Amino acid sequence: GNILQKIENILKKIENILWKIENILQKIEG
Amino acid sequence: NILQKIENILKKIENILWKIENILQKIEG
Amino acid sequence: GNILQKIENILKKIENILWKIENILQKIEG
Amino acid sequence: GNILQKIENILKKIENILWKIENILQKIEG
Amino acid sequence: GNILQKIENILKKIENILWKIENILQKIEG
């Protein structure tokens, strides 16, 4: 129930961190 | 549904990782 | 749909992409 | 300790590793 | 094993690959 909500929330955080990594790499390569 | 949302976020994560992978291919280039 | 099978399939692709990333990074570090 | 909790723990570990990777890159780009 | 265990196992592989990636980056300050 709420554990699925915890899993969803962690995946959103993972997504957000990956976006940050992508942006740093884009600036480096750009 | 929560399972569909989880699936949707994972698809987004896959897409971001593809972008990261292509950028690294360029950097290693 | 079969949401759990879709989730499994997406995770397999994520694994594959990450393995490619690790290999590219190995070359960069070399 | 059910399978969902185990999955949650692994995702939390993934999140933390990604944070570390981002933290290192933030330094590299300066 | 069942579908949730298959998913857990793929997540473990993802974690492990990310740890490898992190390991390479950690060397710079380490």
Side-chain angles (χ1 to χ4, degrees), chain A residues 1-4 7-12 14-30, chain B residues 1-4 6-11 13-29, chain C residues 1-4 6-26 28-30, chain D residues 1-28 30, chain E residues 1-25 27-28 30:
Chain A
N2 194 30
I3 181 57
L4 294 182
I7 288 172
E8 189 205 347
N9 284 348
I10 298 166
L11 289 169
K12 286 177 172 180
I14 284 163
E15 185 191 339
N16 192 73
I17 298 164
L18 285 169
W19 271 127
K20 293 177 174 342
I21 291 169
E22 191 266 357
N23 189 70
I24 294 162
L25 290 176
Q26 256 184 47
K27 290 194 288 203
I28 292 173
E29 198 275 332
Chain B
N1 190 321
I2 187 58
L3 296 184
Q4 183 65 58
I6 283 172
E7 183 200 337
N8 287 349
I9 297 165
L10 286 170
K11 285 179 172 180
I13 284 165
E14 184 192 337
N15 289 334
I16 301 164
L17 285 169
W18 271 126
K19 290 178 171 48
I20 288 166
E21 192 268 359
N22 180 74
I23 296 162
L24 286 176
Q25 263 181 348
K26 291 193 178 172
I27 291 173
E28 194 269 332
Chain C
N2 194 324
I3 303 175
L4 298 182
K6 288 170 175 176
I7 285 173
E8 189 203 347
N9 284 348
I10 294 166
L11 287 170
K12 286 179 172 181
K13 287 177 180 181
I14 286 165
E15 184 191 338
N16 190 249
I17 300 164
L18 284 171
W19 184 81
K20 290 178 172 163
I21 286 168
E22 194 267 358
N23 290 333
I24 294 162
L25 183 50
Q26 259 181 303
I28 290 171
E29 136 132 332
Chain D
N2 61 60
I3 191 59
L4 299 184
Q5 290 173 304
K6 290 169 174 176
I7 283 173
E8 190 206 348
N9 282 347
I10 300 167
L11 287 169
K12 201 71 197 176
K13 290 173 181 180
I14 285 165
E15 185 193 340
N16 289 334
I17 297 166
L18 284 171
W19 176 86
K20 182 62 174 181
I21 288 167
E22 189 204 323
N23 184 77
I24 292 163
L25 288 177
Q26 260 180 350
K27 295 189 181 171
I28 288 173
Chain E
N2 60 58
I3 184 58
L4 297 184
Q5 295 174 310
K6 289 169 174 176
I7 284 170
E8 191 205 349
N9 282 349
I10 299 166
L11 285 170
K12 285 179 172 181
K13 286 25 164 195
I14 285 165
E15 184 193 337
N16 192 72
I17 296 165
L18 283 168
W19 173 83
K20 290 178 172 163
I21 289 168
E22 189 200 53
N23 187 63
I24 293 163
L25 289 171
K27 295 188 182 170
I28 300 171

